[PDB]
Design a binder for this molecule. Structure first.
Ligand SMILES: *C(=O)/C=C/NCC(=O)CCO
Ligand SMILES: *C(=O)/C=C\NCC(=O)CCO
Lengths: 260, 260
């Protein structure tokens, strides 16, 4: 009501396109803004890949311990963890943490390969009831975020529903659900995004994303002071290929939908 | 300099008092702004406490695995990790990680108690040649940040020199230095502060703080794309007791001093 008006006011001054999906698990209420429009996921896609590899680890005992070779030719555009291990190895646990907490694009490419390509991540999405998610490309081209391109996109509504099932639902075994939530809570990249819009007392696990067209994304599980968890997806994209990131817009969207 | 004009402009437009110390380890060059003025450290003091415990673990080789009791009465104002272990235990390693990466105030009180009180943190600072740093109080009163109050203060220059010795120098043993850097690089709270002012490709370990009078702090070790490491300290405080935190001022400061 006032929230829809305020989200429209924010978008109108933002210089881009804003998508919001909030799920309040206290009462299963939702706040949706362009929640059925497709947005480029960029690195928010890493949550689906890490979750798919967690699911694999329910049946392959010690999968997370399995060392994976990192070669110089594996490195892509953003490799803060992987570069230390070129001509060496990282475990699937280390690749999962590097992708989620550091947004390591080489780490994500090893998760994708472990799942049999982009289509294997999409198949996992389908298996947990997400019919909207699609991963089409590897890193780093999955972040081109070209307006109108359906590659590597989802909708705020579908991503909010998926994150709820992965982090609070029974899409994963209990140990795997706890590991995902532990990784998301240890994110290093999120303080300027959704978190920036919330009271300092609230606990957040999130995964950010960014790419071309100034695309600026965050998906978060939020444990508010004295309240049941929230799921929040904030996606934002701009019309110019070289636009700057707008994490402030995401913070503003989070303040609007949580202001009560 | 251009840099001096930019920092003076940032400070004046912020309404506050800004303290900046950059060390460039390529050539030991410095950028300095009010770098010898005292500022309330707030949670940036956690680095000295965690480093003091690391130093103790060089002679007490099992210390980081020691279980510490968390009682309900131990909980202070911000306990994101410790509240999960009330009526249980956490190891000194888990408490160091909680303090550094989550700014857990109950975890910091455990580190202070391990060192025999705020005096024990100050004694470690003096053992590594920091004659400026003082810790006077426990959490959460060490964050009051009252203008003119010398308690729980240091200077940007002294904290930058100290962070250099701890993370890049020989204040700690090689293992302990590596562990401190690993903890700082895994900080969850920093993406809106120094990091937000830097090129995305630069790797950062940092410790934020905030307290009374809108005090907003960050201390960081920076491995730039293709350059020798930097140490940067950005301290900020405001005249009004319940002023808003301003992490954007620290990001602006970081951009100004690194743009060259
Ligand atoms: C995913 O959204 C991005 C992953 N890493 C590439 C970067 O450059 C991260 C910093 O924006
Ligand atoms: C740190 O500066 C002061 C307290 N740390 C915990 C807190 O109260 C806010 C988040 O850092």
């Amino acid at each position: 009501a006032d929230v829809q008006q305020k989200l429209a006011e924010l978008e109108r001054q933002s210089g881009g396109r804003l998508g919001v999906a909030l799920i309040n698990t206290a009462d299963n209420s939702q706040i949706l803004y362009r929640a059925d429009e497709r947005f480029p996921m960029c690195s928010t896609s890493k949550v689906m890949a890490a979750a798919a590899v967690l699911k694999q680890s329910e049946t392959q005992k010690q999968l997370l311990n399995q060392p994976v070779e990192i070669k110089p030719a594996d490195l892509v555009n953003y490799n803060p963890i992987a570069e230390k291990h070129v001509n060496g190895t990282m475990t699937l646990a280390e690749l999962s943490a590097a992708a989620l907490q550091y947004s390591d694009n080489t780490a994500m490419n090893k998760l994708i390969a472990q799942l049999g390509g982009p289509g294997g991540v999409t198949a996992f999405a389908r298996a947990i009831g997400d019919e909207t998610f699609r991963l089409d490309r590897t890193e780093p081209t999955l972040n081109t975020a070209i307006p109108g391109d359906p590659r590597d996109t989802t909708t705020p509504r579908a991503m909010a529903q998926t994150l709820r099932q992965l982090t609070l639902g029974h899409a994963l075994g209990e140990t795997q659900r706890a590991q995902l939530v532990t990784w998301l809570k240890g994110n290093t990249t999120g303080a300027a995004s959704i978190r920036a819009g919330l009271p300092a007392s609230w606990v957040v696990g999130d995964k950010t994303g960014s790419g071309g067209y100034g695309t600026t994304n965050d998906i978060a599980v939020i444990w508010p002071k004295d309240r049941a968890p929230l799921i929040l997806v904030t996606y934002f994209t701009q019309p110019q290929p070289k636009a700057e990131s707008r994490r402030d817009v995401l913070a503003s969207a989070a303040k609007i939908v949580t202001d009560g």
